[PDB]
Amino acid sequence: FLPTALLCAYGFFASLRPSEPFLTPYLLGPDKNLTEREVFNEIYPVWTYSYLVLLFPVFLATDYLRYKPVVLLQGLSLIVTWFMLLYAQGLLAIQFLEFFYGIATATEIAYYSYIYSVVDLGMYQKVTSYCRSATLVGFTVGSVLGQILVSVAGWSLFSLNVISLTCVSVAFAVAWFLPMPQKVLKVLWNDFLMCYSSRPLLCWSVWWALSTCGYFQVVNYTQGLWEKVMPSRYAAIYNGGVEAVSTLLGAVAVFAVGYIKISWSTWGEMTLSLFSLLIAAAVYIMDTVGNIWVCYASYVVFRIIYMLLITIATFQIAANLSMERYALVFGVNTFIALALQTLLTLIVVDASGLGLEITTQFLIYASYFALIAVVFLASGAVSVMKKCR
Ligand SMILES: Cc1ncc(CO)c(CO)c1O
Numbered sequence: 001f002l003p004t005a006l007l008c009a010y011g012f013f014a015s016l017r018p019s020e021p022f023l024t025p026y027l028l029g030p031d032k033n034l035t036e037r038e039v040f041n042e043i044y045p046v047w048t049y050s051y052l053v054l055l056f057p058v059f060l061a062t063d064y065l066r067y068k069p070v071v072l073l074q075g076l077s078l079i080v081t082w083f084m085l086l087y088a089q090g091l092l093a094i095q096f097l098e099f100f101y102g103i104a105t106a107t108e109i110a111y112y113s114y115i116y117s118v119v120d121l122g123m124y125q126k127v128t129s130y131c132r133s134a135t136l137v138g139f140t141v142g143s144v145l146g147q148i149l150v151s152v153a154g155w156s157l158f159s160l161n162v163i164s165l166t167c168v169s170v171a172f173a174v175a176w177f178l179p180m181p182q183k184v185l186k187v188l189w190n191d192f193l194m195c196y197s198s199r200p201l202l203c204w205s206v207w208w209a210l211s212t213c214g215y216f217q218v219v220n221y222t223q224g225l226w227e228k229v230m231p232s233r234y235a236a237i238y239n240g241g242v243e244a245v246s247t248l249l250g251a252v253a254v255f256a257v258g259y260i261k262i263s264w265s266t267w268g269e270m271t272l273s274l275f276s277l278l279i280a281a282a283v284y285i286m287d288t289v290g291n292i293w294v295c296y297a298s299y300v301v302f303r304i305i306y307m308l309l310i311t312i313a314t315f316q317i318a319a320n321l322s323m324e325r326y327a328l329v330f331g332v333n334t335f336i337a338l339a340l341q342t343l344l345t346l347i348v349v350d351a352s353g354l355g356l357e358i359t360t361q362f363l364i365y366a367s368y369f370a371l372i373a374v375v376f377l378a379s380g381a382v383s384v385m386k387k388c389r
Pocket of ligand 1: 021220
């Protein structure tokens with residue numbers, strides 16, 4: 001019990017990052033004095049590229065080292081990331097800054113998969129439910145703490161990211177004392193291939209991956225959009241409260257998805273298409289309001305619909321999937337999804353390619369969110385063609 005309590009405490013401390021909601025005013029202010037165009041155009045794409053190229057090696061090293069040193073890697077990466085975030089000037093230094101954050105984020109899969117390597121299989125589901133609940137409540141607590149310390153307390157971000165670094169150091173020091181984790185050419189190629197040679201095997205997969213693409217593309221630059229529609233020089237940004245309420249409602253909706261007994265085979269495609277249409281409407285609205293409270297509201301609704309869609313996707317996949325296939329499928333689909341966001345980054349995001357302005361990148365994205373609905377409807381249309389007969 002005590003190792004598991006240490007696990008949940010370490011996860012709570014590592015996820016407790018008060019500085020996550022308030023990242024954007026730190027860079028724009030006298031703290032770094034960086035051109036935000038250059039930041040948006042160059043700093044972030046190499047993070048995505050490094051995460052793509054580095055996910056596979058560390059994911060295989062987890063099995064190579066039997067999940068033991070990966071938490072140490074995550075802790076050291078947090079330490080070096082926060083040191084570099086406190087000390088970095090120019091362009092290449094901040095490129096390394098974000099490379100460190102990428103190699104840190106690449107080990108969240110290792111964290112969430114190590115839990116299976118030490119506890120009983122029957123108890124694994126309940127303990128990982130407790131772990132994700134701890135992560136969610138730590139996210140909410142950190143967000144509200146940052147909001148209180150920034151607005152209610154009127155404390156500057158300097159002490160806030162100092163205590164963020166202190167918290168990640170405490171997390172590493174706690175995680176150092178874990179117990180022992182006692183636990184491919186054609187076979188592994190067929191291992192993921194068999195997860196697509198059936199009617200429901202291939203289905204929902206690319207849909208989940210492209211929804212993941214939409215979120216991982218919009219969440220990073222939502223901060224920039226909020227800052228550009230309302231400068232922080234003469235305004236205060238309420239990121240902590242919106243993040244807290246969004247995550248709380250997402251968790252509530254995830255819990256409530258299984259609380260209604262509805263068969264998937266009746267109208268699963270219709271619900272998926274409706275969810276995609278709502279997501280496209282939300283992103284087009286947040287593109288086309290030019291205000292502050294309404295754009296937060298649209299963001300909240302978009303987050304909620306995102307959680308509903310991915311949650312029902314996870315139920316469908318897990319019903320289709322097997323007990324030992326979770327890690328492999330979550331690896332392969334994540335890999336192809338990351339290849340896809342990286343590709344689209346080559347088209348639009350980077351300054352070497354087209355480099356379209358962040359403001360004007362959300363126009364077509366409704367049709368991008370609708371194109372996945374069109375092919376779902378195109379698959380639905382054949383299904384509708386075959387439904388009556
Ligand atoms: C530490 C840290 N690093 C990177 C990002 C996203 O680029 C975030 C979210 O804005 C963050 O909190």
